Amino acid sequence: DPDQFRAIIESPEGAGHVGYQYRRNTGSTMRMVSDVLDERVSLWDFHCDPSGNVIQPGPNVDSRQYLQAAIDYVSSNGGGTITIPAGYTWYLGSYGVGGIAGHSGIIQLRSNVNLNIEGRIHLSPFFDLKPFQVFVGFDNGDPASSGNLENCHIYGHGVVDFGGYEFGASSQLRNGVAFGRSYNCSVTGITFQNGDVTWAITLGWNGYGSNCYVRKCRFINLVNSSVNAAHSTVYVNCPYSGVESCYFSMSSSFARNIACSVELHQHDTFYRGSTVNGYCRGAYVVMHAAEAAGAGSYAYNMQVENNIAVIYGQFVILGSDVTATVSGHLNDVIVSGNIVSIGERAAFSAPFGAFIDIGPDNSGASNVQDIQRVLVTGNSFYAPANITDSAAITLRANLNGCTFIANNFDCRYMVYNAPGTTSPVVQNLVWDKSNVIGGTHANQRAGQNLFDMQFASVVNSTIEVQLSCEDLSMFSCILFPASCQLSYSKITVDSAWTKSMSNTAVFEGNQQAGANVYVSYPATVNLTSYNTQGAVPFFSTDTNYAWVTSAYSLSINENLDFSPPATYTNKANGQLVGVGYNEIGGVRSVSVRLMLQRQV
Amino acid sequence: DPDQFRAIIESPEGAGHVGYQYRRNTGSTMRMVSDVLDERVSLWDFHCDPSGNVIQPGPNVDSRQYLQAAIDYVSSNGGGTITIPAGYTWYLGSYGVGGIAGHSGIIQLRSNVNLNIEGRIHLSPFFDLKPFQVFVGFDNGDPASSGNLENCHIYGHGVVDFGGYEFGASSQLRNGVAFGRSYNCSVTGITFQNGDVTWAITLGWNGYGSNCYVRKCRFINLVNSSVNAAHSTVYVNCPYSGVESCYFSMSSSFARNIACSVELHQHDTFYRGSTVNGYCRGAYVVMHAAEAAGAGSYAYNMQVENNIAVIYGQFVILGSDVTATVSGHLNDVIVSGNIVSIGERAAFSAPFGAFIDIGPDNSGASNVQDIQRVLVTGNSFYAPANITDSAAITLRANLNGCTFIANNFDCRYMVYNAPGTTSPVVQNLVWDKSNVIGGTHANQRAGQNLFDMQFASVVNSTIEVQLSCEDLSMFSCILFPASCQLSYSKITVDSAWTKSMSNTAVFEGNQQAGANVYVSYPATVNLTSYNTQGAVPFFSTDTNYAWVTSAYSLSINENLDFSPPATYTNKANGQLVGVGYNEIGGVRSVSVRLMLQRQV
Amino acid sequence: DPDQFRAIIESPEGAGHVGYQYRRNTGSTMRMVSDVLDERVSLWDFHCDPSGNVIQPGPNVDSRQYLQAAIDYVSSNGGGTITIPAGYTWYLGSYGVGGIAGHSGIIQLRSNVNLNIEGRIHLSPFFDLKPFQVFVGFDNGDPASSGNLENCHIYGHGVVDFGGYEFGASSQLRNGVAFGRSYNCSVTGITFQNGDVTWAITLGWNGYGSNCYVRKCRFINLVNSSVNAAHSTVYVNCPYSGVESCYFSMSSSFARNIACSVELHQHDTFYRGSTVNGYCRGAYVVMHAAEAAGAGSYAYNMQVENNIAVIYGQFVILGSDVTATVSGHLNDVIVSGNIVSIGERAAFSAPFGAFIDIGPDNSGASNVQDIQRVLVTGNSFYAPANITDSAAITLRANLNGCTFIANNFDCRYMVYNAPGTTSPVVQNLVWDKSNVIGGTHANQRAGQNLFDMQFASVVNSTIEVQLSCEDLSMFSCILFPASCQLSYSKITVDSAWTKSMSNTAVFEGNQQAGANVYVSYPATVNLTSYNTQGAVPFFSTDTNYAWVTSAYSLSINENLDFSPPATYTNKANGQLVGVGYNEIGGVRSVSVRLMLQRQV
Numbered sequence A, B, C: 001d002p003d004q005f006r007a008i009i010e011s012p013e014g015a016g017h018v019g020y021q022y023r024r025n026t027g028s029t030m031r032m033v034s035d036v037l038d039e040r041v042s043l044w045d046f047h048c049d050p051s052g053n054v055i056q057p058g059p060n061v062d063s064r065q066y067l068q069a070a071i072d073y074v075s076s077n078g079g080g081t082i083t084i085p086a087g088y089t090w091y092l093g094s095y096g097v098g099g100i101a102g103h104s105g106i107i108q109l110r111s112n113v114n115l116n117i118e119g120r121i122h123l124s125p126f127f128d129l130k131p132f133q134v135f136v137g138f139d140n141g142d143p144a145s146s147g148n149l150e151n152c153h154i155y156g157h158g159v160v161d162f163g164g165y166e167f168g169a170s171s172q173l174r175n176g177v178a179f180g181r182s183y184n185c186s187v188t189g190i191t192f193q194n195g196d197v198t199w200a201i202t203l204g205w206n207g208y209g210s211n212c213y214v215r216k217c218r219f220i221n222l223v224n225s226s227v228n229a230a231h232s233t234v235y236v237n238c239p240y241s242g243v244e245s246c247y248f249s250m251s252s253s254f255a256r257n258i259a260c261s262v263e264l265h266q267h268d269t270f271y272r273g274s275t276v277n278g279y280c281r282g283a284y285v286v287m288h289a290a291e292a293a294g295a296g297s298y299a300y301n302m303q304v305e306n307n308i309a310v311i312y313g314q315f316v317i318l319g320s321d322v323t324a325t326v327s328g329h330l331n332d333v334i335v336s337g338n339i340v341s342i343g344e345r346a347a348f349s350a351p352f353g354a355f356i357d358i359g360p361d362n363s364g365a366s367n368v369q370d371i372q373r374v375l376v377t378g379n380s381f382y383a384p385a386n387i388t389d390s391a392a393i394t395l396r397a398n399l400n401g402c403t404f405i406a407n408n409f410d411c412r413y414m415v416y417n418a419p420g421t422t423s424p425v426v427q428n429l430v431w432d433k434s435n436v437i438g439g440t441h442a443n444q445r446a447g448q449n450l451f452d453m454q455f456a457s458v459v460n461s462t463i464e465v466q467l468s469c470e471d472l473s474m475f476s477c478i479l480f481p482a483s484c485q486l487s488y489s490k491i492t493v494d495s496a497w498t499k500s501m502s503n504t505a506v507f508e509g510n511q512q513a514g515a516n517v518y519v520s521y522p523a524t525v526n527l528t529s530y531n532t533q534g535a536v537p538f539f540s541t542d543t544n545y546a547w548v549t550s551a552y553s554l555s556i557n558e559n560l561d562f563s564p565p566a567t568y569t570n571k572a573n574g575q576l577v578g579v580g581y582n583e584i585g586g587v588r589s590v591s592v593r594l595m596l597q598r599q600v
């Protein structure tokens, strides 16, 4: 048998016959070399032909079956981490089988089986013009019948490369990682690049899942064709999950019209600390009734914070909707610390530029939403001067509340909705005086209202307009068409930089006269006094001030021989009246800039 | 000796006789296989019986001595990283010995010895009803006599499972990781679950330590019994240390009354980017005089940012206290970007709901604190409408300053302390007008004051109340009992949504008359004029306005034949007086809503 | 040949003859032991003499050539990760050769070759008093002729120790990691310590590079001598790059005058979540025209967020400058969530304390900058009471815009520039009323203006001063010297805590009279009435009020027999005039505190 010894050694069992003890420590386990090598595993351990000879990866080799055999085997031992070695590109060239075939799946992920991707995974041209989802954690073609994927992490310095292939048809779907009904799963460090896909990563399934995250990943050039119907790089569809410290970049013209970086679709989800360039949209924050199975009908505790973006459309898009039996609700959202610009483009050349959009549902309905208790604070937004279609908020569907405090918005509109489109019902819209309104679009606003209140109704709302520079081009600071009801609201226009404006606040239906409307704004008023020497009344010539509770002078008095009143009340006939002083008698006639006040 | 060759090879020294050169590179080191295997180490290298045969882990095997032998040996070589292999559960079934026995220690950590926990560490039922601290970095039973633990990191995808065992007695202590006097130590990635413990992780010891962190960890179901006296998942007791991007969840009813996610107890500490569900409390931020040995008597540079929480009690609890010889101080705190809700519960069913609590000391003393220079900004807080016991701040102990700017608070009270309890001394409480006060509790506030100023005294404080909707249920917006002194303060109530309120600001001791009190609020006032045609005075019927410096009309004038004054001063007898206008003579009698102003 | 078998086995090819199959899986690859060992690589694989015998590291061994041979070889295979083993200190004792010699380079980094530093890398005394850059990613002495460094990550629990050696001459440069023209490079986890260097890490080169990051690193004691000209621990000189969750500490007195933690020099860069102690400065945010080659002439999307600092000079320093052919621009910056203190020091003992500094260029020019669209929000700043030289903003060079909202600034000055120095041109400076002004420096401000507007001109600016306590020591709240033009601006001083101030707002050139200046502030005014019983005019004795549009009483009326007017206008001769009431006749003389208003 010393023949058998040499033979044993050269055989696949040879390492199992060579002894080892850690650092020659006599207190350590007496092991065999194979035991120590068995502590780790790589694709090389499965990337072999039927006789066991290793196969080199490359563009003419389909690595799929080998990677799947590796995952299957490690799963059978309770899990571990498979390395995809550095220094090689591992091509995938066929579809998987079984439960992932209903998802156009390539590789099936398994619980407790982690992938350390150090090398590159590329798609072969077998996938050109076809659907695919590269890594799939469902174990059934019907997600409702799927088991869970748990404790599965994909990480490393490596790369998933989608081969540059365009979509074959708009109806197709393409994904990088679908974790499925996914609990404690994550992707960290990986670069996803060079594709035309629907998503790079999806987390959860209709609210099933928990604790799934995307961290320190890069997503580069993942839309490239006019065939691609839509793209959102990460879709978060389970609670207690999020995206942090990622980098998203697109260069395609199509991406400026179709691509969104993240979608948050379940409660207790976040998007923070990320950088986006070249995209249409930053994030959807939406509660879809259709997605309410696993974690309820409410999206709450939604956080979009500390991101950096250059986009062409809207930064954050809010939504909720209904099905026949389920109603979706969105509340308790915070959008904070973000610095966002609309990139250089012509006006109207991409979807309407906005920091916040209150969007209709997927079928265009604007009367299904239940969105409230949103806080938008400490963000910056800029849009170049030429971009007419830029707003701090485009309010296009019913809104039950949104609060803006201490932002800096430098764009064409503050509040906007297109007239003759939707007529949203608006409650609890709060625009605090601490919102700074920039000057980039000064002189560009002919015909336009800075706050264009194109709504069915506004209730329990606050708009405290404060300019920081002049813009005499604008038609008004805030305008309410006669079709918009206004009640139980506070609307103020600070006088600074308004002395030369002919219109400040405009109420085309006289809505400022409502019983519970609290307003103030500047106006110019012509007055005429009685003749009397001494204390003498001045009265407005016009009679449109029956709503005014007090007014006071914003003008100097160039006269020596008299002074108009400093302050005014009204009279039943709608004149203002106040008591001035004639040092010498005579009828006086003056035109004065006043702060008109109602109940404030 | 070719017999000895075969024998050498099969022996524990065999790998030390098989040559190796990296990738057949002739410029590489001529090594032996054992040298390459010696670059890594796992528990398997020590998990062996006295004859060196490997032992399989499992519920009837106590892995403690093997893990300790591994740590001891790697420490002896200057450190390294021990893997706790994936695919196995490693049970701990006895107490450690030596310096950790005074801490109910199981495993002793050692400097530069890292644990990569990929598999699961479970506690055996030996620990049921007993104290324990699983990993302990002290090397002495008396922490004052302990050496340091340095450069010790615990990380991986694995799990520490506390076996579900309840506490045996309230007085017992249980911990996962006590790093001790810990410098550059960390826990990353690990799931701590299934226990009834006091803490999961503690960092530092009485201010000794530095640069210790908890990142991307999960803490799940760590309270389960009514025996557990108290739980705080991470206790940070060294400077330059913190918690980031963690997940905390509890399901026990007891956790809603006793559990806190983090405690920050030393300067330059942080809690950010984390998600909490099912807990009583978010974070304590406290300078205990008793803990002031290693880093001084001041907790400064304390940061609670960008967290997401559903809790049942208080979000942030501030404190400082004294011993006979040391006085603790808390200053330079920021609480920012947090989104927090009180979970669904009955009123008074858990500790009083609050965003910020200024808590007494551990013995209930409210006159020992030195808390100042705190900034609370850009946070959201919500509590359901039924939860009477919910406040933006419960101010229950002396306060030397706290600043609120640009938050959104939607709960029952803004400022609250219970009457007939403590009478805190309050300085430098600043509530900026940019705090938005939500409407969820509108109509729920019968008998209640929105700002209930139940203090001994208030000085150098600012309360700028701004409503955003009506709540005519409330007794007042702000009330000062006669027992609260008020001086050198600014108190304003914006008129919006207040026209129908009978009380806006209430000063039960006439404190608004103080020399350095600056106030304004709406009131209804009855006036009567003299008969005279022309400019004519109107005087208040009541005489309680000797403190008023000016007042102006918040009401329209329904009359044609006269107008009351737009603006009023006072007279020595406490009447208001202003000059209106009688177009026709006659004594006039009117009831007007005024903005009463003092020194503003 | 069984002689040759034993011989084969003991030779460097021996492991290539011992068979292995993973976990005895018959479906796995039939490999050799050497194949499995070849999956990893360490310095030990190259740290050998010319005959291949391993060399032990230590202070008398220069490890440089071995580490370079390792990097060179792994590069030749397409990359991988080289471990620098734990438990050893690896000394570097000579300069590298080739392309890195022009950079005083020691080690040349190569693309796709990662370093896992678990042990310690120390500099030997060969480097004492000499320049050095430890790791260099340029491949040419001229960076303009360099190739790129891509996909190179340095990470681990290890340490780079600079040996404590002082600089030999101020003109020398020292660096830890210069990634060069660096794309997807990073440093994670590493401690840099014990040095006198210029930088620890630099990212990019003149805008060439992308996606480079520094995360969870520590930088400890990296300045130690008066020879060191300047230090900035991380210099970010490529876009889409940043620093997060790092720790920076200095103990040297020299560091308080010279050291800065980070510099952001290209667009889409960030500095977040970090802690700094012992430094002069927090971060420069600068667009240098000289550095504009690779990513354009604009620094935009610059983020400084959520940091904790104790510094001695300025927190954030803004800049832009020009060369003959290129003009640098800085815009779209956010500074948010930071908590910053000037450490204990004497007044004037370190560079002028500031939260924000608008600094000149490197040659002192203050008329080259183009800095605008900056948002500073939700930060705290404190400086001890004695530190005269402390300001929220030192505005020392031309400024095209900066917006402050909802900060808490507790220091000597709000806005400051030294008189008789630079006279900056100021546009779009916005100080919102929601900035809280602390009280630490109350009583310290004799001779001083809280807002000291020492500028050539101010346009399109807003200063809304709101005190929160009294400081009657100060000369004024805001002062404009006659040399500062003021136009199209809003300047307000809230009356709270101002009743006893003799000066509130001071316009030494009467600038508040400008046509488009909107102001309000308190003043004391002496008035005298006519004799007449009844409605009767009161007129100011002084004639300096021709600019006043309205005024109203901030004083009570102690009289029964008359009342002064509640509100006043002006007259052409610059008197105020209003209508009061004489119940009994007689000339009245009163001194009243008024809110003077112009166009507000």
Ligand SMILES: CC(=O)N[C@@H]1[C@@H](O[C@H]2O[C@H](CO)[C@H](O[C@H]3O[C@H](CO[C@@H]4O[C@@H](C)[C@H](O)[C@@H](O)[C@H]4O)[C@@H](O)[C@H](O)[C@H]3O)[C@H](O[C@@H]3O[C@H](CO)[C@@H](O)[C@H](O)[C@H]3NC(C)=O)[C@H]2O)[C@H](O)[C@@H](CO)O[C@H]1O
Binding pocket: A102, A103, A104, A143, A173, A178, A198, A199, A202, A204, A205, A206, A230, A231, A232, A235, A237, A260, A263, A284, A285, A286, A288, A290, A291, A319, A362
């Ligand atoms: C691209 C994108 O994210 N758009 C956002 C809107 O999403 C809706 O439209 C997209 C268009 O791609 C998705 O619908 C497509 O896909 C669904 C789901 O695919 C099936 O189920 C998978 C689990 C399985 O792997 C697949 O093989 C398919 O069987 C398909 O049913 C639709 O017909 C198809 O148009 C998106 O669906 C969700 O996708 C996420 C992520 O994969 C899943 O977790 C959810 O279960 C899907 N939800 C539903 C209700 O089916 C649609 O929700 C989005 O509504 C709006 C507003 O936020 O923004 C767009 O940007």
Ligand SMILES: CC(=O)N[C@@H]1[C@@H](O[C@H]2O[C@H](CO)[C@H](O[C@H]3O[C@H](CO[C@@H]4O[C@@H](C)[C@H](O)[C@@H](O)[C@H]4O)[C@@H](O)[C@H](O)[C@H]3O)[C@H](O[C@@H]3O[C@H](CO)[C@@H](O)[C@H](O)[C@H]3NC(C)=O)[C@H]2O)[C@H](O)[C@@H](CO)O[C@H]1O
Binding pocket: B102, B103, B104, B143, B173, B178, B198, B199, B202, B204, B205, B206, B230, B231, B232, B235, B237, B260, B263, B284, B285, B286, B288, B290, B291, B319, B362
């Ligand atoms: C649970 C919690 O964190 N509660 C917070 C309050 O903490 C105080 O009460 C808790 C109750 O558990 C702790 O006191 C218990 O433990 C201490 C410390 O244990 C000893 O020293 C350890 C180093 C050693 O391992 C152990 O074997 C024990 O010898 C004990 O002395 C008390 O009798 C006991 O009730 C907590 O003590 C601190 O614990 C941290 C973390 O372990 C240590 O770093 C500190 O050294 C301990 N501090 C002191 C002064 O001993 C008490 O501080 C807390 O005060 C309030 C306010 O923030 O909030 C509660 O939530």
Ligand SMILES: CC(=O)N[C@@H]1[C@@H](O[C@H]2O[C@H](CO)[C@H](O[C@H]3O[C@H](CO[C@@H]4O[C@@H](C)[C@H](O)[C@@H](O)[C@H]4O)[C@@H](O)[C@H](O)[C@H]3O)[C@H](O[C@@H]3O[C@H](CO)[C@@H](O)[C@H](O)[C@H]3NC(C)=O)[C@H]2O)[C@H](O)[C@@H](CO)O[C@H]1O
Binding pocket: C102, C103, C104, C143, C173, C178, C198, C199, C202, C204, C205, C206, C230, C231, C232, C235, C237, C260, C263, C284, C285, C286, C288, C290, C291, C319, C362
């Ligand atoms: C210390 C610091 O960061 N100070 C900040 C100012 O930086 C300027 O001054 C410093 C002083 O050290 C640097 O100038 C020194 O270095 C440059 C660059 O070195 C050469 O090129 C390297 C690529 C190469 O490795 C070296 O061998 C040298 O050949 C040198 O040209 C100067 O003579 C010398 O004084 C700094 O230069 C930049 O350094 C970064 C980081 O290394 C490089 O990426 C840039 O390419 C250099 N930029 C230029 C224009 O050469 C100077 O920019 C800084 O201006 C101000 C304001 O932000 O703040 C100081 O804190």
Ligand code: NA
Binding pocket: A102, A103, A104, A141
């Ligand atoms: Na499908």
Ligand code: NA
Binding pocket: A455, A456, A457, A483, A484, A485
């Ligand atoms: Na309508």
Ligand code: NA
Binding pocket: B102, B103, B104, B141
């Ligand atoms: Na003890």
Ligand code: NA
Binding pocket: B455, B456, B457, B483, B484, B485
């Ligand atoms: Na009292």
Ligand code: NA
Binding pocket: C102, C103, C104, C141
């Ligand atoms: Na050089």
Ligand code: NA
Binding pocket: C455, C456, C457, C483, C484, C485
């Ligand atoms: Na000038």
